[PDB]
């Protein structure tokens, strides 16, 4: 049982790391490209 379950645990951890690797890059790219560039503050409107 342990042999099987342990190997599964290793596979689970490897998948997690792969998804994190992408996730970290994803957010860093988004910010550095289009969402870190001096976010425009919210403003109210009454003219329209």
**Of the candidates 24, 42, 41, which has an alpha carbon nearest to the alpha carbon of residue 32?**
24
Give dist(CA 32, CA 36) in Å, integer: 6
Nearest to 28 by CA among 36, 17, 19: 36
Q: Please state the three-class secondary structure of 1-48 as a single string.
A: CHHHHHHHHHHHHHHHHHHHHHHHHHHHHHHHHHHCCCCCCCCCCCCC
Long-range CB contacts for residues 38-46, cutoff 8 Å, separation at least 24 = none
Could you tell me the sign of the dihedral formed by the alpha carbons of 17, 20, 26, 32, in that order?
Answer: negative
What are the tokens at 9?
A: 């645990």
The sign of the CA dihedral 17, 22, 28, 30 is negative
Structural biology method used: cryo-EM
Q: Locate tokens 């490209």: which residue? A: 33
């Amino acid at each position: 049982f342990h042999q099987s379950a342990k190997d599964l645990l290793d596979q689970l951890k490897l998948y997690e790391q792969e998804q994190f690797d992408d996730w970290s890059r994803d957010i860093q790219s988004g910010l550095s490209d289009s969402r870190s560039g001096l976010c425009i503050e919210a403003s109210s409107r009454i003219m329209e």
